Amino acid sequence: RQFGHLTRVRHLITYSLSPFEQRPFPHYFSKGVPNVWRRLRACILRVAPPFLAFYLLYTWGTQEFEKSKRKNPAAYVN
Amino acid sequence: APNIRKSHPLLKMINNSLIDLPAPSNISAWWNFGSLLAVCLMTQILTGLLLAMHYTADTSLAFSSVAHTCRNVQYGWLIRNLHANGASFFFICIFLHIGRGLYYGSYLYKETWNTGVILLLTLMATAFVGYVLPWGQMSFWGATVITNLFSAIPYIGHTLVEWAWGGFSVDNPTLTRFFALHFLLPFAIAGITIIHLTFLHESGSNNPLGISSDSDKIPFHPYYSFKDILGLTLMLTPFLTLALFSPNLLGDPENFTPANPLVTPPHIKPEWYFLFAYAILRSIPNKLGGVLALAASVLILFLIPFLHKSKQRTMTFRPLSQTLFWLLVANLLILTWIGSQPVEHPFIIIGQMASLSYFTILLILFPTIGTLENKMLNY
Amino acid sequence: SRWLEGIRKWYYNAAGFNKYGLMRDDTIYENDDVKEAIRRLPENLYDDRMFRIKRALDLNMRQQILPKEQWTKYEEDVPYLEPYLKEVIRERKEREEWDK
Amino acid sequence: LVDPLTTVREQCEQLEKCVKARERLELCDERVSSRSQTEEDCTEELFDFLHARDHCVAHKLFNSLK
Amino acid sequence: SDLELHPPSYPWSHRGPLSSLDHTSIRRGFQVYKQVCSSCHSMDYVAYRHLVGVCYTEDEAKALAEEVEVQDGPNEDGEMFMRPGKLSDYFPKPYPNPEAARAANNGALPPDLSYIVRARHGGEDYVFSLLTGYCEPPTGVSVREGLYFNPYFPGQAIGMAPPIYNDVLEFDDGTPATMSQVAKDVCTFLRWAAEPEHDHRKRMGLKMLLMMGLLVPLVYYMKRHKWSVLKSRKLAYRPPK
Amino acid sequence: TLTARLYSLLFRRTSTFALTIVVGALLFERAFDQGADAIYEHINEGKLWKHIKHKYENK
Amino acid sequence: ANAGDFGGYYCPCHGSHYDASGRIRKGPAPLNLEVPSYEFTSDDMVIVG
Numbered sequence: 001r002q003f004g005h006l007t008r009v010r011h012l013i014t015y016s017l018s019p020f021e022q023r024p025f026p027h028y029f030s031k032g033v034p035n036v037w038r039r040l041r042a043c044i045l046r047v048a049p050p051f052l053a054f055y056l057l058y059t060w061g062t063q064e065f066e067k068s069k070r071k072n073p074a075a076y077v078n
Numbered sequence: 079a080p081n082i083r084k085s086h087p088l089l090k091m092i093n094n095s096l097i098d099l100p101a102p103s104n105i106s107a108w109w110n111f112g113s114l115l116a117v118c119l120m121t122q123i124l125t126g127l128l129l130a131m132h133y134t135a136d137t138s139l140a141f142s143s144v145a146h147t148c149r150n151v152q153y154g155w156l157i158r159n160l161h162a163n164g165a166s167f168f169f170i171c172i173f174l175h176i177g178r179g180l181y182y183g184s185y186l187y188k189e190t191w192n193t194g195v196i197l198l199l200t201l202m203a204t205a206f207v208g209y210v211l212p213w214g215q216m217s218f219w220g221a222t223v224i225t226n227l228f229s230a231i232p233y234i235g236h237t238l239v240e241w242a243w244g245g246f247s248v249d250n251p252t253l254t255r256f257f258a259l260h261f262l263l264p265f266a267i268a269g270i271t272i273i274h275l276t277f278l279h280e281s282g283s284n285n286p287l288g289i290s291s292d293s294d295k296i297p298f299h300p301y302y303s304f305k306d307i308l309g310l311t312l313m314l315t316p317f318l319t320l321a322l323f324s325p326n327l328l329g330d331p332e333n334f335t336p337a338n339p340l341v342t343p344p345h346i347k348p349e350w351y352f353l354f355a356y357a358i359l360r361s362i363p364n365k366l367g368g369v370l371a372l373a374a375s376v377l378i379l380f381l382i383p384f385l386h387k388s389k390q391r392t393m394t395f396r397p398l399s400q401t402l403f404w405l406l407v408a409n410l411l412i413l414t415w416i417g418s419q420p421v422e423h424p425f426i427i428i429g430q431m432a433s434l435s436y437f438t439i440l441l442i443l444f445p446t447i448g449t450l451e452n453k454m455l456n457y
Numbered sequence: 458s459r460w461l462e463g464i465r466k467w468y469y470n471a472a473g474f475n476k477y478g479l480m481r482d483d484t485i486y487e488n489d490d491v492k493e494a495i496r497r498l499p500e501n502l503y504d505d506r507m508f509r510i511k512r513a514l515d516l517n518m519r520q521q522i523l524p525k526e527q528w529t530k531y532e533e534d535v536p537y538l539e540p541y542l543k544e545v546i547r548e549r550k551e552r553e554e555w556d557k
Numbered sequence: 558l559v560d561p562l563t564t565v566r567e568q569c570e571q572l573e574k575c576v577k578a579r580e581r582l583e584l585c586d587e588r589v590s591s592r593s594q595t596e597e598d599c600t601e602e603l604f605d606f607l608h609a610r611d612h613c614v615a616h617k618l619f620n621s622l623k
Numbered sequence: 624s625d626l627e628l629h630p631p632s633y634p635w636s637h638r639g640p641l642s643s644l645d646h647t648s649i650r651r652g653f654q655v656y657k658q659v660c661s662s663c664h665s666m667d668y669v670a671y672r673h674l675v676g677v678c679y680t681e682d683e684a685k686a687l688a689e690e691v692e693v694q695d696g697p698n699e700d701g702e703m704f705m706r707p708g709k710l711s712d713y714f715p716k717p718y719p720n721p722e723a724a725r726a727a728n729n730g731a732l733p734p735d736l737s738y739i740v741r742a743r744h745g746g747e748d749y750v751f752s753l754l755t756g757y758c759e760p761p762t763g764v765s766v767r768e769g770l771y772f773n774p775y776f777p778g779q780a781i782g783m784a785p786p787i788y789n790d791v792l793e794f795d796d797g798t799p800a801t802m803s804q805v806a807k808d809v810c811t812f813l814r815w816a817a818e819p820e821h822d823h824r825k826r827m828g829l830k831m832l833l834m835m836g837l838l839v840p841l842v843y844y845m846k847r848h849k850w851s852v853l854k855s856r857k858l859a860y861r862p863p864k
Numbered sequence: 865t866l867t868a869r870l871y872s873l874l875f876r877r878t879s880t881f882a883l884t885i886v887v888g889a890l891l892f893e894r895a896f897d898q899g900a901d902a903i904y905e906h907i908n909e910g911k912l913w914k915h916i917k918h919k920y921e922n923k
Numbered sequence: 924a925n926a927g928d929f930g931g932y933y934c935p936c937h938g939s940h941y942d943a944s945g946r947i948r949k950g951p952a953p954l955n956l957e958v959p960s961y962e963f964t965s966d967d968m969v970i971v972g
C-alpha cells in the first residue's frame with residue numbers, strides 16, 4: 001500500500017509549523033515530565049504486581065534452598 | 079517519471095521501504111525492535127564473517143584458533159566480544175520484538191508473524207551452532223544434548239542424530255559440518271527476513287492502538303529513519319558497554335575450558351537466551367515429554383494468532399488480559415531463573431509450575447480473559 | 458449480587474479507550490465483517506469516526522491524552538456500528554448456511 | 558618480614574561477627590571430635606567463620622599490598 | 624552435600640570499568656608464575672612476545688626467553704633438536720602431555736592457567752582466595768592421602784599443595800614477598816594473561832561511552848526536531864453542518 | 865554571531881556543510897583522542913607500562 | 924559418580940539419578956546405563972569388550 005489510496009478523509013484541518021519555527025526541546029516541566037508520571041502512575045499498578053510476585057517467589061525459593069542445606073542441630077542430638 | 083527515486087527498478091525498492099513508506103504516526107520504541115534485529119543480523123554477519131577469517135574448524139585446532147583469533151589478530155578480540163554479545167542483543171531484541179508483536183496482536187498480520195517465528199527458530203538454531211565452534215566444555219556438551227535432543231523422535235531419531243552430527247558421537251566432523259551450517263544459516267535469516275518484510279508491507283505496519291491508521295500515516299523516511307538511527311545508538315550503547323567493559327558478563331566462563339568428551343561439567347547451565355525452554359524441558363521427566371514440552375515451548379508462537387479472541391486488536395484497552403500478559407512476561411523471566419537453578423525442591427516444582435502457567439496463560443487464560451472482556455462490552 | 462451493569466461500567470473506564478475520546482466501536486479491530494459494516498455507515502457518522510480515530514492517533518502519537526472533560530462517558534457511548542455490523546453478520550450466517 | 562594478611566586476619570578474627578562465629582565453630586569442632594560415631598561435619602560452621610573473616614580481610618588487606 | 628563457600632571480593636587495582644591493570648604488579652605476577660607455577664602450570668596462549676611493552680623490555684624479554692631451550696624442527700637428517708628459546712616461543716609446557724603431568728602430580732591434572740581467571744567463577748577473587756586460604760579440615764571431615772584441604776575449592780580436597788608461602792622468591796624490585804603479597808601479584812597476572820586487551824579494552828570503553836553521551840543526544844534532538852512537525856500539530860473537524 | 869555566521873557560511877550550501885564535517889572530524893578526532901587518552905592515563909597513574917617503562921628508563 | 928540421591932550417579936544436564944547398578948531411578952532419563960560386554964581373567968584382572 002502506497003500514498004493517495006489510504007482513506008476517504010473529509011473535513012480535517014491540520015496546522016503544523018516548520019521545525020525551525022518551533023522548538024523541539026519542547027515544554028518539559030509543563031506538559032513534559034507531568035505526562036511521564038501520568039503514566040508511571042497508570043500502569044505501575046498493572047505491570048509491577050506480577051514482577052513483584054516473581055521477586056518473592058525468587059527470594060522465597062532461594063532462601064528456602066539455602067536453608068534446606070544447613071544442618072538440623074537435632075538430626076543427631078546423640 | 080522525472081522522479082527516478084521511483085523510476086529505477088532497484089532504486090525504487092529503497093525509496094519504497096525507507097523513503098515514502100507509509101508508517102503509522104503513533105509508534106512506540108517497541109517498533110524499533112526489528113530495525114534493530116536487522117542491525118544484529120548485520121553486526122553478526124559482519125563480525126562473524128570476519129571472525130571466520132581466523133577460525134579453524136577442527137577439534138585439535140578449533141578451540142585454540144579462536145583464542146589465537148583474539149590474542150593474535152588485531153582487534154580480533156574486539157570482534158569476538160562484539161559477536162558473542164551481538165548474539166544476545168540479538169536475542170534480546172528478538173525477545174522484545176516478539177513481546178511487542180504479542181501485545182498489539184501484530185500476530186494478526188499472520189504471515190508476517192509466521193515468518194517471524196521461522197526467524198526466531200533459525201536464530202535459535204544458528205546460535206546453537208557457532209557456540210559449538212569455539213569448542214569449549216559448553217560448546218561440546220551443548221552439541222551433545224541439543225543434537226541428541228532429536229533422539230526423542232522415534233524411528234527416524236537415533237538415526238537422524240548419527241547424521242545430525244558427524245558419525246556416532248560429537249566429534250570433529252560434527253564440528254566442521256556445524257561451522258558450515260553456522261556460516262550458511264545467517265544468510266538464510268537474512269533471506270527470510272526479506273520475505274518477512276515483504277509480507278509485512280503487504281499490510282502496513284501495525285500501530286499501538288490497533289485501529290486503522292490510514293487516517294494518519296507519515297512518510298517512513300523523514301520520521302522513522304531518524305527514529306531508527308536513534309534507537310540504533312540507544313540499544314547499541316549497552317551491547318557495546320558489555321563488549322568493552324564486562325564482555326563475559328553474559329558468557330558462562332565454564333566454556334573457557336576446552337572440551338573434554340569425557341567429563342560434562344557439574345553445573346551445566348545453558349545460554350541465558352535459552353534457559354526458559356530449557357527449564358520447561360527439565361520439569362517434564364520423560365525423554366519424549368521433556369523434548370515435546372520444549373518443542374511446543376517455542377513452537378507455540380505459531381498458535382498465538384489462533385488464540386486471539388479480543389474484538390479489539392492490541393490490548394491497550396484490555397487491562398484484564400493486559401496484566402495476564404505481564405503475568406506471562408514475568409512467568410517467563412521466572413522459568414528463566416528456575417532454569418539457571420539446579421534441580422531441588424525449592425525449585426523444580428516452582429519450575430514445572432511456571433512451566434504450566436506458561437502454557438495455560440497462552441493456550442487457555444488469554445482466549446478466555448479474551449472473550450470475557452468482549453462481553454464486558456456487550457460483544 | 459454484583460451488577461453486570463455495575464461491572465461493564467468498570468471495564469469501560471478500565472479499558473480507558475475513552476480517555477483518547479473514541480467510542481467503543483471506534484476500536485473493534487477491523488475484520489471483514491466490520492469493514493463491510495463500516496462501509497455501510499452513513500457518511501455522517503463515518504467522517505465523525507474518522508476524525509475521532511485520527512485525533513486518537515494524533516494523541517497517542519504524542520503520548521498525551523484528552524482532558525478529563527473530553528473523555529466520553531460510559532452511558533453516552535454511542536454504539537454507532539453495532540447495529541449495521543449485526544445485520545452483516547446474520548446476513549453472512551444466512552448465506553453461509555444456504556451454501557450447504 | 559611479616560605477612561599483612563596474617564596481621565589483618567588477627568584484627569578481623571576479632572570483629573563481633575567472627576567471634577560470634579569462631580565460637581559457634583569451636584563448639585561444633587569439639588562437639589564432633591568428642592564422639593566416636595557421628596556423621597556431622599563442622600564444615601558449614603567453618604565457612605560461616607571464614608565467610609565472615611576473609612570478608613573484612615578483603616576490605617583492608619589490599620591496602621598494605623603494593 | 625553440594626555445600627560450598629563463596630570467595631569474598633577484593634578491591635583489585637584493576638576492577639574499575641575505567642581502571643587499567645597495575646602493570647608493575649603483573650611484572651611480579653609474571654615472575655611468580657615463571658618462578659613457581661611454570662613448573663606445573665602450562666600457559667600455552669601467551670608468549671614472551673607479549674611481555675614486551677606491557678611489563679618487560681624487548682631486550683629484557685628476549686634474554687628472558689633465552690632462559691629456556693625448546694625442541695625445534697627436523698634436521699637435514701631430520702631429528703628434533705633443542706635450541707635457545709627465541710622471542711616468539713610460547714611459555715614452556717612443564718609436561719609432554721597431561722597424563723604425564725597427572726603422573727607427576729599425585730594423580731591430578733594441574734589445569735593450564737591461560738584462561739584460568741575466567742574459567743572459574745570469581746576469577747582473581749577466587750584464585751587469590753584459593754591460594755591464600757588453606758587450613759585443617761573441620762571435624763568429621765577427612766581429606767584422603769595426597770590431597771590437601773582448601774575450603775574454597777569444590778570438594779575441599781585439592782590435588783595442589785599450597786604452592787605459595789612467604790619468601791618463596793624475591794621480587795627484584797624490593798617488595799615484601801609475603802604470601803598475601805605474592806599471591807596478589809600472581810592473580811593480577813593471571814588476569815592480563817587471560818585477557819591482555821584489558822586496558823586497551825577499557826580505554827576503548829571509555830571513548831565508546833563519551834560518544835554515546837555525545838551522539839545519542841544529538842540524534843535525539845534531531846529525532847525531536849524532526850517530529851515536532853507532528854508533536855506540535857493540531858486537528859479540527861469542520862463539516863459544513 | 866557564531867550560529868548565524870556558521871549557518872550562512874558553513875551549513876547553508878550542502879557543498880560547504882560536508883566540507884566542515886570533514887575538516888571538523890579531523891579536528892574532533894585529534895582533540896577527542898588526546899583528551900580521552902589523557903583522561904584515561906591520568907586515572908591510572910603509575911600503572912601503565914608507559915609509567916613503569918622507566919624502571920628500565922627512570923621515574 | 925559419587926553424587927546424587929541414589930548413591931550411584933547423577934547427570935548435571937537434566938537431573939537423572941542413577942543407582943550403583945547404573946539404573947535410572949529418578950529424573951527424565953529413559954533407560955538404565957549401558958552395560959558393556961565383559962569378563963574377569965583372574966583375581967585382579969578385568970577385561971571389557
Ligand code: HEM
Pocket residue numbers: 655656659660661662663664728731732733734739743750753754776780781782783784786787809
Ligand atoms: C602459582 C602462583 C600457582 C597458581 C596461581 C596456582 C593456581 C592453581 C589454580 C587456580 C588451580 C585450580 C582451579 C580449580 O578449581 O581446579 C590449580 C590447580 C592445580 N595446581 Fe596450581 N597453582 C600454582 C602453582 C602450582 C604448582 C607449582 C604446582 C605443582 C607443584 C601446582 C599444581 C596444581 C595441581 C595439581 C592442581 C590440581 C587441582 C585438582 O584437580 O584437585 N600449582 N592451581
Ligand code: HEM
Pocket residue numbers: 119122123124125126127128129130131133144158161162165168201204205207208209210211212260261262263264265267329
Ligand atoms: C545470525 C547471527 C549469528 C549468530 C546468532 C551467531 C552466534 C554465534 C555464537 C553465539 C557463537 C559462539 C561465540 C562464543 O564463543 O561466545 C558464534 C561463533 C562464531 N560465529 Fe557466529 N553467529 C552468527 C553469525 C555468524 C556469521 C554470519 C558468521 C560467519 C559466516 C559467524 C561465524 C562465527 C565464528 C567465526 C565463530 C567462531 C569463533 C567464536 O566462537 O567466537 N557467526 N556465532
Ligand code: HEM
Pocket residue numbers: 108109110111112113114115116119172175176179182184185186187190191193194195196197198199267271274278283284285379
Ligand atoms: C529475523 C529478525 C527479524 C527482523 C530483523 C524482523 C523485522 C521486522 C520489522 C522491522 C518489522 C517492522 C515493524 C517493527 O519493527 O516491529 C517487523 C514486524 C513484525 N515482525 Fe519481525 N522481524 C524479525 C523477527 C521476527 C520474529 C522472530 C517474530 C516472530 C514472533 C517477528 C514478528 C513480527 C511481527 C508480528 C511484525 C508485524 C507487526 C508490527 O510491525 O507491528 N519478527 N519485523
Ligand SMILES: CCCCC[C@H]1C(=O)O[C@@H](C)[C@H](NC(=O)c2cccc(NC=O)c2O)C(=O)O[C@H](C)[C@@H]1OC(=O)CC(C)C
Pocket residue numbers: 092095096101105106107109110111112113114116119120267268269271272275283302305306
Ligand atoms: C540495501 C539496503 C536495503 C534496506 C533493507 C532493510 C529495510 O527493510 O530497512 C527497514 C525498513 C527495516 N525496518 C523497517 O522498515 C521498519 C518498519 C516499521 C517501523 C520501523 N521503525 C520503528 O520505529 C522500521 O524501522 C529493517 O528491519 O531492515 C530490514 C529488515 C531490511 O534489511 C534486512 O533485510 C537486511 C538483512 C537481510 C541482512
Ligand SMILES: C/C=C(C)/C=C/C=C/[C@H](C)[C@H](C)[C@H](C)[C@H](C)CCc1oc2c(O)c(OC)cc(OC)c2c(=O)c1C
Pocket residue numbers: 199202203206207216219220223224225242259346347348349352355356359372373376935936937
Ligand atoms: C545444527 C542444528 C540442529 C541439529 C538443531 C538444533 C535445534 C535447536 C533448537 C532450536 C534450540 C536448541 C532451542 C533453543 C531449544 C528448544 C532449547 C533447549 C536447550 O537445551 C539445553 C539443554 O537441555 C542442556 O542440557 C544440559 C544444555 C544446553 O546448553 C549447554 C541446552 C541449550 O543450549 C538449549 C538451547
Ligand code: FES
Pocket residue numbers: 223934935936937938939950951952
Ligand atoms: S543428560 Fe542426563 S539428565 Fe539429561
